Design an enzyme around this catalytic site. Structure first.
Site, PDB file in Angstrom:
ATOM      1  N   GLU A  35       0.817  -1.217   0.000  1.00 24.07           N
ATOM      2  CA  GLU A  35       0.000   0.000   0.000  1.00 24.07           C
ATOM      3  C   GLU A  35       0.848   1.263   0.000  1.00 24.07           C
ATOM      4  O   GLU A  35       1.843   1.350   0.712  1.00 24.07           O
ATOM      5  CB  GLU A  35      -0.951   0.034   1.204  1.00 24.07           C
ATOM      6  CG  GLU A  35      -2.076  -1.001   1.174  1.00 24.07           C
ATOM      7  CD  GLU A  35      -3.145  -0.686   0.149  1.00 24.07           C
ATOM      8  OE1 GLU A  35      -3.220   0.478  -0.299  1.00 24.07           O
ATOM      9  OE2 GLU A  35      -3.920  -1.598  -0.203  1.00 24.07           O
ATOM     10  N   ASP A  44      -7.704  10.493  -3.816  1.00 19.74           N
ATOM     11  CA  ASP A  44      -7.284   9.494  -4.783  1.00 19.74           C
ATOM     12  C   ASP A  44      -8.036   9.704  -6.090  1.00 19.74           C
ATOM     13  O   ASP A  44      -8.811  10.649  -6.225  1.00 19.74           O
ATOM     14  CB  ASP A  44      -7.419   8.064  -4.236  1.00 19.74           C
ATOM     15  CG  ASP A  44      -8.857   7.595  -4.146  1.00 19.74           C
ATOM     16  OD1 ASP A  44      -9.771   8.324  -4.606  1.00 19.74           O
ATOM     17  OD2 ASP A  44      -9.072   6.479  -3.621  1.00 19.74           O
TER      18      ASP A  44
END
Lengths: 165, 165
Positions: A35, A44
């Site tokens: 991650e 995002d």
């Protein structure tokens, strides 16, 4: 997978599936996991605010720098949620490493996706190995296959098979 | 749309499609637009290294803290790249506002998805208003609709239609 990852995972095994997944996600160095990481919240590409190791939620404070320790607590809390969300769906005994690999997979794709997955069906038929191969189908997004997902699933696959070869 | 964005886009119009797109992506303040922003590189949800206004490439120094000035310069090059990628495929005249909205869209969904879109098909047959509406169909990823994309497409659609209302 990178020898440093193997080693961090092996060190984590005594901590159980949660510790194992945590290691997959953050990597041994905190920068170098599966991650991405950021101590300041960011949007995002589907417009969701994210912070720490991919933590999402309406708790995220926009103008704030999260500490290493605040991030660790968030991850622990989120992985606990993943466990609660999928474990009652798993109806056969599985190695803690496979379970850990599955927390990492689900941390990424989400519990809904896991619950309706062919992968989960394979697990419950006792087809542990074949369930691990199914991880390979989860490498598409935006209609396109991604090298980064392919690599991520190969690594998750390896921890998945950690017990059985 | 937010009044602040309305004013910014309006000021940008004499600067052409690229300046308009820049306003959309970076926002009126330069620090809060449609696209996220980080000054330390991070790995995105498909495992791709990213920095600044979503910049990706072979030129990202992992250990570097980027400045705002550096981030804007990179976006500038990337926007010129988007223009190079899609402009030859657009065969009819469109307003700068519309072309700027398209840069922002393509910056999000990629030139491949654009070149094969029903959206582009409609543009080149002169159905400008129909093209703009097509944007609303681009809110899905990973098998679900994302509220953040729905909001983005609505903003991009409004700009797309700036000329004709």
């Amino acid at each position: 997978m990178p020898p440093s990852l193997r080693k961090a995972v092996a060190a984590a095994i005594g901590g159980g599936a949660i510790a194992i997944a945590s290691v997959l996600i953050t990597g041994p160095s905190g920068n170098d996991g599966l991650e991405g990481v950021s101590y300041i919240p960011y949007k995002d590409i589907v417009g969701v605010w994210t912070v720490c190791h991919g933590h999402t939620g309406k708790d995220i404070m926009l103008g704030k720098t999260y500490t290493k320790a605040e991030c660790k607590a968030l991850l622990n809390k989120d992985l606990a949620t993943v466990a609660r969300q999928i474990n009652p769906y798993i109806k056969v005994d599985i190695p803690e490493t496979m379970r850990g690999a599955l927390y990492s997979f689900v941390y990424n794709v989400g519990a809904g996706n896991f619950r309706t997955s062919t992968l989960l069906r394979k697990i419950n038929q006792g087809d542990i190995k074949g369930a691990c191969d199914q991880l390979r189908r989860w490498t598409y997004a935006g209609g396109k296959q991604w090298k980064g997902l392919m690599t991520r699933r190969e690594i998750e696959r390896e921890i998945c098979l950690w017990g059985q070869q």
